[PDB]
């Protein structure tokens, strides 16, 4: 196995694939004028393909991922990196820098089982980025309800939808992708969502997604990501949307966020409770803690509806406001023991639902 490639063509691919001892290695394969790099944890797999425009020789091996990445990253801008297999070592040469890395056999590298694609669609990279970033923060953190630790990906009509929830708060985001899709839902584990997000470079290259009965695959440029799915019965976001909200509040997002952030300082450190008092064109936020300390914020808002008092975990509210990168926010309420819906005043593409504290 031999190849010689410029550093700039190796870096990004190594980065992408690098994020049983053999699981700490990358599989390198030279075949048909292409270098393939694969990384896996048994649950998911990233593969990059690199065209070889210089002389090269076929073969495969496996080398330490971090060490190989760190060597290439440490080399200077515009370096050429020559690689060849010698005995049980992989030699790397650039300029007058030389390295000999340990290897494990390519035949020992684990392969995910083959599976069949049941649903396929394409979408812009920016649509996937929007879908994930809109909801990722609402996924559970190591909940014993495993399905809550991942992200629901749902197809309905011509829309792709993400849903994330931890049993207390929920995020949902739907985007049109211009293709007739089957009605279908799968749960992607948290590590899969992180990787799916990482492979979005920020360019013209559109995403091709393939879903099987137990797997999902995403193709972007010269990268292929594959993950297992999660089994379990994911919550239905439709249940938890305020059915016919009679109370509507509109306020500046940043103003609201800064007031919640200040009030949070004097909230219970563990329970994070704040109280909202809504009245005509006014919101008051209060917080107090076991040390008897007290915060009060009063803000001008646009509010029609009856006066009411409602409690929330201020962290959940702040998370939503930080996720809403916008000028004005709309909140839709029912009563003090029911969920609140929070949205961008200018877009209905994402919705956030937070259940109150008694």
């Amino acid at each position: 196995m031999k190849f010689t490639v410029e550093r700039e063509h190796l870096l990004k691919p190594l980065q992408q694939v690098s994020g049983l001892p053999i699981l700490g290695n990358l599989l390198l394969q030279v075949a048909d004028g292409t270098l393939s790099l694969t990384g896996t944890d048994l649950e998911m797999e990233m593969v990059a393909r690199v065209a070889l425009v210089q002389p090269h020789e076929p073969g495969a091996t496996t080398v330490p991922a971090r060490k190989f990445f760190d060597i290439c990253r440490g080399l200077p801008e515009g370096a050429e990196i020559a690689v060849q297999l010698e005995g049980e070592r992989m030699l790397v040469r650039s300029g007058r820098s030389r390295f000999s890395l340990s290897t494990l056999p390519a035949a020992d590298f684990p392969n995910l089982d083959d599976w069949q694609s049941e649903v396929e669609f394409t979408l812009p990279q920016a649509t996937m980025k929007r879908l994930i970033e809109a909801t990722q923060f609402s996924m559970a953190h190591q909940d014993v309800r495993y399905y809550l630790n991942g992200m629901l990906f749902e197809t309905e009509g011509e829309e792709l939808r993400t849903v994330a929830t931890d049993g207390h708060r929920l995020a949902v985001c739907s985007m049109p992708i211009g293709q007739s899709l089957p009605s279908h839902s799968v749960i992607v584990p948290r590590k899969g969502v992180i990787e799916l997000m990482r492979m979005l470079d920020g360019g013209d290259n559109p995403l091709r997604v393939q879903i099987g009965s137990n797997n999902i695959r995403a193709h972007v440029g010269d990268f292929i990501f594959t993950s297992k799915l999660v089994d379990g019965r994911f919550p239905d976001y439709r249940r938890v949307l305020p059915k016919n909200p009679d109370k509507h509040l509109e306020a500046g997002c940043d103003l609201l966020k800064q007031a919640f952030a200040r009030a949070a300082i004097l909230s219970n450190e563990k329970f994070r409770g704040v109280r909202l008092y809504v009245s005509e064109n006014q919101l008051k936020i209060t917080a107090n803690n076991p040390e008897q300390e007290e915060a009060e914020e009063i803000l001008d808002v646009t509010y029609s509806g009856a006066e009411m008092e409602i409690g929330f975990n201020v962290s959940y509210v702040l998370d939503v406001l930080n996720a809403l990168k916008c000028e004005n926010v709309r909140m839709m309420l029912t009563d003090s023991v029911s969920s609140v819906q929070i949205e961008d005043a200018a877009s209905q593409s994402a919705a956030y639902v937070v259940m109150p504290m008694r």
Binding site: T165, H168, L170, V353, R358
Partner: peptide, 5 residues
């Protein structure tokens, strides 16, 4: 905190 429902 109430459970979301």
């Amino acid at each position: 905190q109430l459970d979301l429902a």
